Amino acid sequence: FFHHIFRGIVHVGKTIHRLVTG
């Protein structure tokens, strides 16, 4: 399903972008 799959990809996506400049 794809209901609350983008809610957990928030901390993730943010993570990468958090280490992007890393």
Residue type at position 12: V
- How far apart CA 22 and CA 3 sit, in angstroms, is 31
C-alpha to C-alpha distance for 22 and 4, rounded to whole angstroms: 29
**Angle subtended at Cα 17 by Cα 3 and Cα 8, rounded to the nearest 5 degrees:** 20
* Amino acid making up residue 21: T
CB neighbour burial string for 1-22, b if at least 16 within 10 angstroms, e if fewer: eeeeeeeeeeeeeeeeeeeeee
User: In 3-state terms, what secondary structure has residue 11?
Assistant: helix
| SS3 state of residue 13 | helix
